[PDB]
Ligand binder design. Structure first.
Ligand code: CL
Ligand code: NA
Ligand code: NA
Length: 203
């Protein structure tokens, strides 16, 4: 009945995102028809694969270069890709640190190696803290080879962490991710974009 564990999403829930900026940054390095490729769906394949760790970062970049027909550098590709990521506001880092007093806090994120490296270097470090300080464990799609909202990802987390779904609260801005978690017995909250969800924890 009582909540012991939190499962927190990264994208949106912690880190602000900017798809427009990322798309435009790709166009600037030469991916002229990236919006045109998005419809083609040639893209969705490479992004979905990266998200499940099914291709390496080297493959991802090669795949981008191949779709661009241009020999842009890894540094360029990473910069354009990482520009999807904006910031984790520090009040959310304070909140995570505080929540640890009462809850075992886990991260459960669909993400990829390039983005994860970026947030660990540029968003999580704060005061004397690093990413290891906020979470008991970080569950990442690309490491797990599964992605939300597949039921198996949630079951894998609860099995690995050794937790009761019924004692678990999941915060994720995707409605379908939450509905799947609910079917497993996990309680959920679906914040809106830019929502400060600290209100959930007011005494
Ligand atoms: Cl995420
Ligand atoms: Na999200
Ligand atoms: Na930790």
């Amino acid at each position: 009945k009582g909540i012991k564990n939190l499962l927190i999403d990264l994208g949106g829930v912690l880190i602000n995102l900017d798809r427009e900026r990322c798309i435009e940054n790709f166009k600037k390095i030469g991916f002229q028809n990236i919006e045109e490729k998005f419809c083609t769906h040639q893209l969705d394949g490479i992004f979905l694969q990266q998200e499940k760790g099914l291709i390496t970062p080297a493959e991802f970049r090669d795949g981008i270069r191949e779709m661009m027909g241009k020999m842009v550098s890894d540094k360029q590709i990473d910069a354009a890709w990482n520009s999807f990521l904006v910031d984790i506001p520090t009040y959310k880092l304070d909140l995570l640190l505080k929540l640890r007093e009462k809850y075992v806090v886990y991260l459960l994120s669909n993400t990829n190696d390039i983005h994860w490296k970026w947030v660990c270097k540029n968003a999580f470090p704060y005061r004397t803290f690093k990413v290891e300080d906020y979470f008991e464990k970080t569950y990442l799609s690309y490491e797990m080879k599964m992605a939300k909202p597949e039921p198996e990802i949630f079951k894998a987390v609860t099995e690995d962490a050794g937790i009761d779904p019924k004692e678990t609260f999941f915060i994720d801005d995707s409605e379908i991710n939450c509905k799947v978690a609910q079917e497993l017995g996990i309680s959920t909250y679906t914040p809106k974009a830019g929502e400060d969800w600290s209100h959930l924890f007011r005494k």
